[PDB]
Paper text:
Cas12i is a newly identified member of the functionally diverse type V CRISPR-Cas effectors. Among them, Cas12i is characterized by a relatively smaller size (1033-1093aa) compared with Cas12a. Cas12i has substantially different efficiencies in cutting two strands of target DNA, which results in a nicking activity that could be utilized to develop a double-nicking approach for genome editing with high specificity. In Cas12i1, the REC lobe consists of the Helical-I domain and the PAM-interacting (PI) domain, whereas the NUC lobe comprises the Wedge (WED), Helical-II, RuvC, and Nuc domains.
The second ternary complex uses the wild-type Cas12i1 to form the R-loop complex after target DNA cleavage (hereafter termed the post-cleavage R-loop complex) and its crystal structure was determined at 2.45 Å resolution. In the post-cleavage R-loop complex, both NTD and TD strands are already cleaved by Cas12i1. The PAM-distal region of the target duplex is released, and the PAM-proximal region of the target duplex is retained in the complex. Interestingly, the cleaved NTD strand stretches out of Cas12i1 and is captured by the neighboring complex from another asymmetric unit. Correspondingly, the cleaved NTD strand of the neighboring complex is determined passing through the RuvC catalytic pocket of the post-cleavage R-loop complex. The overall conformation of the unpaired region dA(6*)–dA(13*) of the NTD strand from the neighboring complex extended into the post-cleavage R-loop complex resembles that of the unpaired region dC(11*)–dC(18*) of the NTD strand in the pre-cleavage R-loop complex. Hence, the post-cleavage R-loop complex not only represents a state of the R-loop complex after the cis-cleavage of the target duplex, but also provides additional information about the pre-cleavage state for the trans-cleavage. For some unknown reason, the cleaved NTD strand accommodated within the RuvC active site was not further trans-processed in the post-cleavage R-loop complex. Notably, three water molecules were identified to form multiple hydrogen bonds within the RuvC catalytic site. Among them, one water molecule interacts with residues D647, N649, D1074 and the phosphate group of dC(11*).
Author numbering: 7 to 825, 834 to 1091
RNA sequence: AUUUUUGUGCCCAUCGUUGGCACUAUUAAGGAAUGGAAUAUAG
DNA sequence: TATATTCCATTCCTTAATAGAACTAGAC
DNA sequence: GTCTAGTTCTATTAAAAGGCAAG
């Protein structure tokens, strides 16, 4: 039920005197310089692990003893790392020598793991551990004793303790609790419980715990058995009984005995170290005197990569074993035949160097249809061969040869329409070995080659050091605190200063490197967001109460837009442009405080201070845990449909609904509350622009810009075409340009299209790349309407940034072209620093736009869910589970387009945001068929699927539209289930308009348009509906789109709704029964 | 402990009327793709 | 126009981690 | 009375009696 997350506030360090900042910088430098020593030492400790140390351990995660040892003994690290490198062929030999036995499959798989041979190499950590014993003059027996103790205390191994605990048990010189005393006491409790196994009241249990401890109170029990530290659960029962909060609790005697019996092991030893003094002396020599806070701070940074890579590498090895087991090695000979293509004459290469073959080279499992069509040709050629008896038998055979090449070429072109184009030579080659290999075996064999290569190429994770950051806080860390708001008011009063200010102060216990002693110091920070949502004080009496979600934000119910005073508004106007935005926010904050509109924030020592030093810059982050209790009793489901070009959508469904609109969904009464599109509106004067969909101003208002662009291309409109069947055709760019220069066209589309044309001009004038340099700057940077100056968050705007990056690549590539030394970023920067800076500026702006799009889309989804939660109750947000969208088997353009979907990034932001609000839950569901299901009818109780639809006038019809409708009437079979819906849709289209296949098949687009206009004119209809893949509309049984109009399709009455709105309802309904189980 | 000028960013033919907005930070690798130049091949 | 490779660059996502809790002797 | 710097804390995964006569 308990859920935990953190919210962070980034800040700007406001510097004090240089000497004060130097003291802090020197301390941060000291911790950073120190961290690598702990990293090296912990690697040596891991190297000393052996079968004796891990004897009788836990079950871990199906990790074998061999794997646990191998991951400790051998690691992949940078070649220039201090540990000496080992060859991969020696890992098993070294393992046998250290282990005494040869490695098992898990350790063997780890050794076989792929890695980049030019950056990383295997390292022997056992040799590193030998270096520790030698360098510190440590007894092998003494270090083994300490290592064994460390394993029990979780200082080393699979499940590590915190750095703070590890530092304390290993190096702490403070008074330790006597472990034997706790062992005798826990043992006595176990004995008494066994003696009275049938007790059932806490009163009886507390009495048994008290008798075991020879005491009459928890306080006397703790002093004798657990003097220092957090209260053990067994002593908490006595304390809670003395408080009176657990008197009615149930008692599970077998469970208490079992849990107590498991802790016994930890208390059979007193943790008497034998080499800690020597190791501490070595550490003091390298990082200075032992301090729990400083050593613990450095150890946490050193430990994180070592522990994390061990966890990740163990899972990866186990994953590889299953993936390898999943391979069918029995198909290797079939794979061997297919791989034979490289040796065959069909494949031809200078060095005849091969490549990996994947299913898309044969068109996946669509080779079978090609085989049947090819067998039929052969069958007819093997049945008409008997009726020959002529000298020219070399006619028919050539007709069989030549028609085999058209069938294959045709297959490759058809498949290449909606996927990667298959390889003609490989399929020709494969047809030649038709008696040699069955077609199903060709697929199994090609699959084996591809699947084997993918599994074998997966790389091991190298162990890389961490760039460190240090934590300051109230407890178990370096001492630090944010001055509290009350202390700030008191400090200001005592200083005869203004009651409020815009700065945040921290006090941290820091080491003075000169004296090597601790000193508390004060530092200043600035963060407007922190001040608004947390820090600024609600000084006025009877201020609004603190918000349920503690943060003071608009989503949490605080608008923060109070009426400003004339002196306040003049302060904003009076300030420079660079400070006006922050001044307005500060003035607005002061107004809400004065007007008593600012809600209270409940202060606590809840914010961690993280400091990271890069150069002379300090990055300070304030983060606080946010606690949430799950609310499983959902009243509303919010479905979200993620789209790429089209708008995203949401649909809300009330569960356990009663009333006029209730629908009975498989015994669950539900009501479709509402659906909508996600838009992010920004006000400009009196109009508003949706950041998500705006494509820019029409060219009508950018004539100077277009003419300026048109003038430059004219001087470089000259361009040839290598694709003209021999002699290239010198075509004209300007004809292409005028098409996109229409006054009606959007600026972003025009700008994106112009970059592509400019790329073509440059490709056609390679020797004159330098000439375009000035034009690119005005287009991308300097121009008033340049890409950098104006762009929305619409898909087209993102594509415009992508093409601009490509054009800069083309300018640079052509600029440095020559007929061996590769061209690097250093070369480009020296060649054109301004152009290179421009490419970086585009990258930085695009990343910022992407982050902004994820946050604004996430905000809209969370706001709607919060609105529904306040109205109805707990809300479950459902998103589509989208994965593995980009594939090598698809064309580059599809993968390129698919990259901007951003469904996962938005979903990840929603999941994090959802964790901050009670009554909100987020899950992902299978998106299968969500675009074709008829919501509230499908699965209630029959499967109901329908085609997507397009709506246009007869004039707007295109040849593609005509061909698409005929394609659905083909009646050729498909492995695509959606194909039937489009077929039924096309059948419905002919019936609804009183048509027949011959009215569309073999009819000119002109004839087709007039036929539809005549029907529509008789029916007094402006537009016609036709089934189209990715069609904007869906004919729904229910009114799920607010703007939907009723229509009678094939004698059935349906609502014409936006297809995406229908989809959001469908996403909400996937496995909806499971959400109310 | 006082700096008083800044947490990070998003949108706009008019960059202001107080213009309109939004947001968990960091470390490190891995996975899957894309762009550019050129090469080989192919009907 | 397709396939495939090499080299220089890039994006979007995933998965290992960090951002401790509760306590008391002893220092004020 | 307070505050800090030091300590230990959490999973669950236990064993064996019970079930049978005269002696």
């Amino acid at each position: 039920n308990a859920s935990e997350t953190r919210k962070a506030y980034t800040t700007k360090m406001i510097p004090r005197s240089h000497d004060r900042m130097k003291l802090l910088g020197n301390f941060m430098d000291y911790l950073m310089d120190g961290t690598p020593i702990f990293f090296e030492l912990w690697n040596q400790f891991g190297g000393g692990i052996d079968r004796d140390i891990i004897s009788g351990t836990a079950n871990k995660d199906k990790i074998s003893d061999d794997l646990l040892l191998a991951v400790n003994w051998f690691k992949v690290m940078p070649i220039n790392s201090k540990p000496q490198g080992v060859s991969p062929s020696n890992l098993a030999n070294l393992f046998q020598q250290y282990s005494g036995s040869e490695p098992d499959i898990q350790a063997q798989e780890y050794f076989a793991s792929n890695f980049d041979t030019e950056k990383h190499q295997w390292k022997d950590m056992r040799v590193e551990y030998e270096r520790l014993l030698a360098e510190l003059q440590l007894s092998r027996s003494d270090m083994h004793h300490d290592l064994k103790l460390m394993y029990k205390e979780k200082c080393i191994g699979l499940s590590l303790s915190t750095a703070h605990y590890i530092t304390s048990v290993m190096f702490g010189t403070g008074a330790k609790n006597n472990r034997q005393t706790k062992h005798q006491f826990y043992s006595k409790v176990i004995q008494l419980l066994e003696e009275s196994t049938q007790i059932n009241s806490v009163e009886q249990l507390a009495s048994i715990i008290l008798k075991a401890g020879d005491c009459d109170s928890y306080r006397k029990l703790r002093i004798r058995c657990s003097r220092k530290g957090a209260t053990p659960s067994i002593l908490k029962i006595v304390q809670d009984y003395e408080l009176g909060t657990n008197h009615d609790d149930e008692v599970n005697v077998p469970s208490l005995i079992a849990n107590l019996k498991e802790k016994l092991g930890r208390f059979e030893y007193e943790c008497e170290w034998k080499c800690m003094e020597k190791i501490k002396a070595f550490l003091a020599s390298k990082v200075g005197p032992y301090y729990l806070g400083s050593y613990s701070a450095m150890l946490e940074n050193a430990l994180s990569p070592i522990k994390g890579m061990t966890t990740k590498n163990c899972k990866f090895v186990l994953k590889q074993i299953d993936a390898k087991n999943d391979i069918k090695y029995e198909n290797e000979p079939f794979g061997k035949i297919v791989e034979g293509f490289f040796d065959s004459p069909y494949f031809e290469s200078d060095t005849n160097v091969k490549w990996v073959l994947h299913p898309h080279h044969i068109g996946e499992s669509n080779i079978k249809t090609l085989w049947e069509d090819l067998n039929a040709i052969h069958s007819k050629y093997e049945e008409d061969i008997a009726s020959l008896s002529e000298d020219k038998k070399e006619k028919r055979i050539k007709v069989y040869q030549g028609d085999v090449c058209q069938t294959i070429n045709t297959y490759c072109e058809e498949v290449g329409k909606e996927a990667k184009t298959p390889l003609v030579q490989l399929l020709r080659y494969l047809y030649s070995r038709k008696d040699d290999i069955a077609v199903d075996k060709i697929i199994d064999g090609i699959t084996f080659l591809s699947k084997k290569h993918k599994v074998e190429k997966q790389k091991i994770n190298p162990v890389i050091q961490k760039y460190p950051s240090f934590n300051f806080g109230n407890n178990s860390k370096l001492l630090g605190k944010i001055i509290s708001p009350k202390d700030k008011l008191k400090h200001n009063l005592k200083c005869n200063r203004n009651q409020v200010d815009n700065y945040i102060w921290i006090e941290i216990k820091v080491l003075n490197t000169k004296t090597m002693r601790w000193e508390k110091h004060h530092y200043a920070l600035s963060s407007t967001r922190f001040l608004e949502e947390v820090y600024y004080p609600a000084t006025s009496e009877n201020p609004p109460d603190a918000l349920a979600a503690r943060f003071r934000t608009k989503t949490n119910g605080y608008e923060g837009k109070p009426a400003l005073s004339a002196e306040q508004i003049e302060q904003i106007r009076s300030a420079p442009v660079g400070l006006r935005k922050v001044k307005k926010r500060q003035m607005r904050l002061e107004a809400a405080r004065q007007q008593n509109l600012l809600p209270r924030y409940t202060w606590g020592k809840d914010f961690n201070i993280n400091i990271c030093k890069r150069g002379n810059n300090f990055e300070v982050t304030l983060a606080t845990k946010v606690k949430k209790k799950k609310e499983k009793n959902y009243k509303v489901v919010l479905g979200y449909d993620a789209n790429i070009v089209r708008k995203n959508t949401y649909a809300a469904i009330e569960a356990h609904a009663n009333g006029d609109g209730v629908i009975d969904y498989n015994d669950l009464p539900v009501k479709p509350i509402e659906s909508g599109f996600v838009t992010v509106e920004s006000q400009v004067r009196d109009k508003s622009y949706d950041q998500l969909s705006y494509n820019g101003v029409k060219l009508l208002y950018c004539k100077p810009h277009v003419e300026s662009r048109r003038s430059f291309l004219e001087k470089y409109r000259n361009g040839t075409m290598k694709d003209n069947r021999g002699n290239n055709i010198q075509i004209d760019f300007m004809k292409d340009f005028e098409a996109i220069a229409d006054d009606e066209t959007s600026l972003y589309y025009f700008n994106m299209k112009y970059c592509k044309l400019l790329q073509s001009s440059i490709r056609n004038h390679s020797s004159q790349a330098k000439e375009y340099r000035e034009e690119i700057f005005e287009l991308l940077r300097d121009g008033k309407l340049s890409v950098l100056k104006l762009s929305s968050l619409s898909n087209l705007s993102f594509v415009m940034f992508k093409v601009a990056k490509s054009l800069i690549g083309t300018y640079f590539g052509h600029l440095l072209k020559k007929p061996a030394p590769p061209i690097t970023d250093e070369d480009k920067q020296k060649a054109d620093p301004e152009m290179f800076a421009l490419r970086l500026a585009l990258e930085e702006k695009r990343l910022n736009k992407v982050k902004s799009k994820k946050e604004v889309i996430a905000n809209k989804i969370v706001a709607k869910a919060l609105e529904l939660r306040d109205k109805y109750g707990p809300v479950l947000i459902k998103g589509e589970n989208i994965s593995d969208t980009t594939k090598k088997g698809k064309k580059s353009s599809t993968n390129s387009f698919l990259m901007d979907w951003l469904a996962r990034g938005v979903a990840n932001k929603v999941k994090e945001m959802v964790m901050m609000h009670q009554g909100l839950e987020f899950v992902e569901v299978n998106p299968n068929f969500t675009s074709h299901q008829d919501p509230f009818v499908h699965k209630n109780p029959e499967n109901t699927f329908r085609a997507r639809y397009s709506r246009c006038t007869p004039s707007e019809l295109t040849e593609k539209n005509r061909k698409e409708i005929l394609s659905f009437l083909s009646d050729k079979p498909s492995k695509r289930p959606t194909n039937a819906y489009y077929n039924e849709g096309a059948m419905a289209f002919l019936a609804t308009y009183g048509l027949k296949k011959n009215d569309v098949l073999g009819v000119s687009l002109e004839k087709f348009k007039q036929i539809m206009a005549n029907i529509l004119h008789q029916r007094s209809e402006d537009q016609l509906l036709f089934p189209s893949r990715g069609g904007m509309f869906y004919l729904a049984t229910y009114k799920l789109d607010a703007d939907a109009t009723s229509v009678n399709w094939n004698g059935k009455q349906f609502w014409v709704c936006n297809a995406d709105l229908v989809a959001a309802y469908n996403v909400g309904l996937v496995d909806i029964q499971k959400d109310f189980k």
